[PDB]
């Protein structure tokens, strides 16, 4: 395909089927996981927000997710969530890779921003309404903030604008190859993450 956007989609297809291997305690694990991941991702994004290899996909208001995961994590783990939430080896690895890329090879940062943001944006509605029912919650209205990007009205419109920005990114054939491989790496990290949360909730 032409677009780096189209190339990413294709690559993340033959890899978007794996791991169909996997309750409350589980949702709380995926929420805590996502928090540690977004803290590192968003930290690295800020550090590289003005560089030409990332500036085009810098959308701070539309996509930041740390604050929402914070509201949610306060509801799931309580007022002292920051002390109690877990931080496992698989979470640690995703976080380190995130830091390595942001520090050493920022041109690949777009790979992780895409996997995370566009993945969570279009998959949310599904991953939400679904697991939530099997969750049964009160009438309070907290805990699911992560699934709503308030500053985005049209998911469809935003994705189009986001993909076009990725396509505006000036890169070479070689760099394009690492961006795609890096996208594949992010899927592995996510896959292994769920794998570890499984060998955890079943022991």
Swiss-Prot record:
GO cellular component terms, semicolon-separated: cytosol; endoplasmic reticulum; endoplasmic reticulum membrane; extracellular space; membrane; mitochondrial outer membrane; nucleoplasm; nucleus
Principal EC category: oxidoreductase
Site feature Important for catalytic activity, where: 120
Post-translational modification: A soluble form arises by proteolytic removal of the membrane anchor.
Topology versus the membrane: Single-pass type IV membrane protein
Enzyme Commission number, as recorded: 1.14.14.18
Sites where the protein binds heme b: 9, 16, 114, 163
Induction per the UniProt record: Heme oxygenase 1 activity is highly inducible by its substrate heme and by various non-heme substances such as heavy metals, bromobenzene, endotoxin, oxidizing agents and UVA.
Record's disease association: Heme oxygenase 1 deficiency: A disease characterized by impaired stress hematopoiesis, resulting in marked erythrocyte fragmentation and intravascular hemolysis, coagulation abnormalities, endothelial damage, and iron deposition in renal and hepatic tissues. Clinical features include persistent hemolytic anemia, asplenia, nephritis, generalized erythematous rash, growth retardation and hepatomegaly.
Notes on the domains: The transmembrane domain is necessary for its oligomerization.
Protein name, per record: Heme oxygenase 1
Organism the protein comes from: Homo sapiens
Organism placement in taxonomy: Eukaryota, Metazoa, Chordata, Craniata, Vertebrata
Name of the gene this protein is made from: HMOX1
